[PDB]
């Protein structure tokens, strides 16, 4: 079985072994036992290589595990810029909803990765998107006390 | 002749020690190195002095106390002081690590690793004595040492001297010049478990001498050098009367005779007047009726209380200098009416009058002016429960919340203590009550 | 009582160890050699406190140097007062911990753990009456996580009545974009609420907003963040180190500031704030009770104080102190608990640190530190919902529940310090 080979191999960077495993018929959008898929592995151990190979052989952008996560979700969580600015490229839901209410703004705001929450704001993520306790990316920002945060949200 | 041994206890009850010593020294005429050239009888005696000085065979008068602190800094200053060869050496006792401002380390874990050979070492002063009366138990309230030690100690003298006398000079805590959160807690605990164990125990609260230092002797900002000055100054005119020849409080017995009608209610309040600063060295002497009018106001008392909302069970004043027994009447009479002086019932509203005729002495280097003549009023008034409900009071806020309680328990102590040491408070300001205030 | 024994773990904890030493050496006219050049016997009064006398009347920190990465010990040694520090006092690892909390506390810190304990009872052995210790580290890494507060436990077990006392750096996404560092300092926190009796919370968001909004510094580095740490330290052990008034140490300052035994985790605060190159009494007292003072991003008119300890430096009226210190708690009065009477105590040392004629150091038990806790517990909460890097952690032997067990100790000391603040005395 080739799936689980790919989920691997996406997880460990292993470039040369993705490109072997889909030559030989490979399921691209194999999923774990959590539903997460290759592009979900690439994504969060920041194999941005991967990432770009992938989505030019099928993979599903908008893919989601059992709680909700999409690929950018975990991108914007983990901090991977580059990551984050090729999947939009490709069609990722900038405003995706997860199982607690997240959407990669959220992630991106409680990480504190400034750089992430610019390119999401520029490419139309909802600033009044509300998580399972009724809080936006402004309500983290304030509640926290983080001012770089709320005055980039005040653009 | 009847000996008093006097122990000082922690910081507090070491400086002030120190201080008082220093005072009696040169009361008595007795050098910083002990000799005494007035002193006739070399080797002994069974006059006055004797009581709190004993004699060696090289005619060294060395006093019959023992100083105690569970850390050295204190005591070390004693043993490189001015009057450091006038103490013996084996009753200035220190250990290695204090309380740390916790009753239950001074009783229940520091406290035990010092207590035998505290208790050995009175022994020996007390084997070199042929009619020994008592003690006097100088120590804070607030203090680990001063509140936990001091009960342990007091609780051991208790079995160890049955029939024996104990008086207590303790040091009420004021938030100007204290060092620990905890001075109530320990204060109160401290109350409790030595209330059973003490005859007698004359309250100084630092917030009154405090006050006295700024008021009277222009001193801005008082240190506990200066309060421990005029301290030692009140507990001089209190223990005059067991130093010197006189007929009032002569004994340590007669000390709770006079003061103290019921046990529990054993605190008297002193009061002393004229206070005048050493800048004022010409100042006006006062007559007789002008420094017993001043005993009667609340500025010059020793605790912060009212006596107009309280009764007096009983009154001892206690002359020092150039006073006519005539003008001590006459003043008596006239502060009868005039003011409002209410006794209780049960007891004769008559006054206890002492007169000693030298006039007190100052230490070089005080903050006060000579003065012709001086008294010191003692007396029992229901107005000094006012001290305990302000105290009573601190200890209710933090303990409702049990704040810094974890600290105790964490030293052999129950929580139970605190209650049961708050229920005996609250039975003492009931039984202030029962009697009038 | 007077002997403390400090310890530096890991990185972090090596690197503002050795500043806490070129600070107070200073201080105490103690040069890179050990010779005293001092022109004050105040400066040698207390010395016995943090050195040891070696022979020829020269001054040897009690300091134990650890680490799992060899290169932290050729950076401290290679300092100006590198060479100070015992040679046998140096116990370092092969393989670090790669800011792994897992790899310090139960596999490669596990393994060295037993040499550390051996210099500590050394040291310990060789003090006339200890009184406590001193750790040094930072909570987002792996060495100073979980290699010392293994080392805080094992410590406990044979010293269960020696005063444990921390300087614990506190992560954030602004100084180091390490996403694992939530997980490292939340485990931390779990372990350091049951076994110190006092914490000093220095919080690295409190370090860069104050470089880069208050010192006008575009992009502060680990030099600037400690020249502030190292003043904080000064500060708040000026009193163990000079006479004064209070017969310092670390067991009275427990007993005063700590009313509930895990609520010991203090808010530092520092005046004049000031740079690596570049004040009267009322403008000293109103800078330590402003939010941009404080070494904890953490607003304290958002809490209420339980206790609060003030340090001030430098020749000034007492009168005066005891004046401004009144007017600051009038005005404030309602972010003070009433039911802790007298709960703000003021100390006074005329020798002021280098630099500086007039400071002030605050040292404050508030319940606005749960705001930090907070940041904290959201951050972990994030990652930990996406179980992301797990394997990481349960790779080297832990169990999963020990991150749930460290979560919900952290959101019930957040609780705790919620439900003080709103209590009333009447
Ligand atoms: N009048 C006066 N009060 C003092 C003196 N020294 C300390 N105090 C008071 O005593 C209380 C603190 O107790 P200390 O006597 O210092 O403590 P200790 O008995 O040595 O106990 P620990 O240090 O906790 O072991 C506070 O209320 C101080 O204000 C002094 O010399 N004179
Ligand atoms: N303020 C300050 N923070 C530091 C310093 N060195 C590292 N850190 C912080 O410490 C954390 C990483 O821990 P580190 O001490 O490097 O790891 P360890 O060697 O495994 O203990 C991050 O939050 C860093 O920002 C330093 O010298 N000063
Ligand atoms: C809530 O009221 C109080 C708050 C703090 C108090 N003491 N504070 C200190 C501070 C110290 O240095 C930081 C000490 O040196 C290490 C120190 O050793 C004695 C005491 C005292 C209080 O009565
Ligand atoms: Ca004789
Ligand atoms: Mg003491």
Redesign the interface.
């Known amino acids: 079985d080739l799936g689980k080979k790919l989920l691997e191999a996406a997880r460990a960077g292993q470039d040369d072994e993705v490109r072997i495993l889909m030559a030989n018929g490979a399921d691209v959008n194999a999923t774990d036992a959590s539903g997460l898929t290759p592009l979900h592995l690439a994504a969060?151990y920041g194999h941005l290589e991967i990432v770009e190979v992938l989505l030019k052989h099928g993979a599903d952008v908008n893919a989601i595990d059992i709680?909700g996560?999409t690929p950018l979700?975990?991108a914007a969580?983990?901090?991977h810029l580059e990551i984050v600015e090729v999947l939009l490229k490709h069609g990722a839901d900038v405003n995706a909803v997860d199982t607690?209410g997240?959407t990669p703004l959220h992630?991106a705001a409680?990480?504190?990765?400034l750089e992430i929450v610019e390119v999401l704001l520029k490419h139309g993520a909802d600033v009044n998107a509300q998580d399972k306790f009724g809080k936006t990316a402004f309500d983290?920002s304030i509640?926290?006390?983080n001012?770089?945060l709320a005055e980039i949200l005040q653009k | 002749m009847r000996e008093c041994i006097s122990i000082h206890v922690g910081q507090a009850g070491v400086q002030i020690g120190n201080a008082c010593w220093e005072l009696y020294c040169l009361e008595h005429g007795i050098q910083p190195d002990g000799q005494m050239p007035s002193d006739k009888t070399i080797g002994g005696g069974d006059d006055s002095f004797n009581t709190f000085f004993s004699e060696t065979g090289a005619g060294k008068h060395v006093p019959r106390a023992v100083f105690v602190d569970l850390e050295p800094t204190v005591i070390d200053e004693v043993r490189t002081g001015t009057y450091r060869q006038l103490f013996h050496p084996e009753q200035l006792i220190t250990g290695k690590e204090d309380a740390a401002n916790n009753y239950a380390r001074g009783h229940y874990t520091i406290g035990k690793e010092i207590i035998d050979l505290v208790l050995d070492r009175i022994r020996k002063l007390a084997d070199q004595c042929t009619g020994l009366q008592g003690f006097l138990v100088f120590h804070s309230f607030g203090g680990g040492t001063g509140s936990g030690f001091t009960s342990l100690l007091m609780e051991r003298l208790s079995v160890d001297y049955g029939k024996k006398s104990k008086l207590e000079f303790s040091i009420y805590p004021a938030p100007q010049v204290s060092t620990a959160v905890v001075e109530p807690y320990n204060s109160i605990l401290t109350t409790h478990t030595t209330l059973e164990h003490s005859d007698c125990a004359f309250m100084v609260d630092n917030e009154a001498i405090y006050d006295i230092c700024r008021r009277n002797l222009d001193i801005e900002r008082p240190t506990y050098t200066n309060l421990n000055r005029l301290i030692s100054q009140i507990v001089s005119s209190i223990t005059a009367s067991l130093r010197f020849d006189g007929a009032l409080n002569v004994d340590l017995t007669e000390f709770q005779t006079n003061l103290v009608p019921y046990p529990r209610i054993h605190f008297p309040l002193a009061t002393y007047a004229p206070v005048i600063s050493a800048e004022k060295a010409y100042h006006e002497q006062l007559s007789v009726a002008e420094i017993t009018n001043a005993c009667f106001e609340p500025a010059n008392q020793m605790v912060k209380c009212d006596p107009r909302h309280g009764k007096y069970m009983a009154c001892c004043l206690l002359y020092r200098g150039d006073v006519v027994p005539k003008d001590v009447n006459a003043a008596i009479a006239t502060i009868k009416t005039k003011r409002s002086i209410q006794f209780v019932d049960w007891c004769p509203t008559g006054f206890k009058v002492g007169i000693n005729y030298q006039p007190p002495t100052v230490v070089p280097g005080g903050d006060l002016a000579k003065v012709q003549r001086a008294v010191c009023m003692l007396s029992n008034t229901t107005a000094i429960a006012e001290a305990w409900a302000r105290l009573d009071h601190k200890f209710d806020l933090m303990y409702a919340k049990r704040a810094f309680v974890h600290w105790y328990v964490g030293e052999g102590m129950e929580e139970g203590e605190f209650s049961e040491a708050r229920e005996d408070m609250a039975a003492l300001e009931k039984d202030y009550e029962e009697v009038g205030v | 009582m007077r002997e403390i024994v400090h310890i530096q773990a890991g990185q972090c904890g090596n690197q503002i160890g050795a500043k806490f030493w070129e600070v107070i050496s200073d201080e105490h006219g103690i040069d890179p050699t050990g010779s005293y050049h001092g022109d004050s016997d105040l400066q040698l009064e207390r010395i016995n406190v943090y050195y040891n006398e070696a022979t020829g009347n020269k001054y040897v920190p009690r300091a134990i140097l650890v680490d799992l990465e060899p290169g932290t010990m050729d950076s401290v040694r290679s300092g100006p007062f590198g060479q100070i520090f015992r040679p046998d006092n140096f116990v370092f690892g092969q393989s670090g911990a790669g800011n792994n909390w897992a790899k310090g506390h139960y596999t490669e810190g596990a393994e060295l753990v037993d040499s550390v304990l051996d210099v500590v009872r050394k040291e310990s052995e060789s003090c006339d009456c200890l009184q406590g210790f001193q750790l040094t580290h930072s909570l987002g890494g792996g060495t100073g996580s979980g290699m010392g507060t293994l080392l805080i436990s094992k410590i406990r077990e044979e010293y269960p009545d020696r005063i444990m006392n921390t300087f614990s750096v506190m992560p954030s996404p602004k100084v180091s974009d390490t996403v694992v560092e939530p997980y490292n300092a939340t485990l931390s926190v779990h372990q350091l609420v049951e076994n110190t009796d006092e914490t000093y919370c220095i919080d690295n968001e409190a370090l860069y907003d104050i470089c880069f909004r208050t010192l006008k510094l575009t992009t502060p580095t680990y030099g600037d963040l400690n020249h502030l740490v190292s003043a904080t330290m000064s500060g708040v052990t000026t009193c163990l180190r000079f006479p004064g008034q209070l017969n310092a140490d670390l067991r009275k300052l427990a007993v005063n500031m700590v009313p509930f035994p895990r609520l010991h985790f203090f808010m530092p605060g520092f005046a004049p704030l000031t740079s690596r190159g570049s004040l009267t009494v009322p403008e000293l007292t109103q800078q330590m009770f402003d939010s941009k003072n404080m070494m904890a991003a953490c607003d304290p008119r958002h809490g209420r104080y339980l206790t609060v300890a003030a340090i001030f430096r430098g020749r000034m009226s007492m009168k005066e102190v005891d004046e401004q210190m009144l007017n600051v708690q009038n005005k404030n009065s309602s972010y003070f608990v009433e039911w802790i009477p007298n709960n703000v105590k003021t100390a006074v040392c005329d020798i002021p640190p280098r630099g500086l004629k007039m400071s002030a150091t605050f040292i404050g038990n508030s319940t606005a530190i749960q705001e930090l806790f907070k940041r904290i517990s959201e951050q972990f909460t994030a990652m930990f919902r996406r179980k992301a890097f797990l394997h990481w952690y349960t790779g080297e032997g832990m169990d999963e529940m020990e991150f749930t067990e460290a979560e919900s100790n952290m959101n019930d000391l957040v609780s705790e310090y919620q439900q003080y603040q709103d209590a009333t005395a009447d």
């Open positions: 969060t709680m996560s979700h975990l969580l983990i901090g607690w997240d992630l409680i990480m504190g990765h983290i509640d926290n006390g001012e770089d």
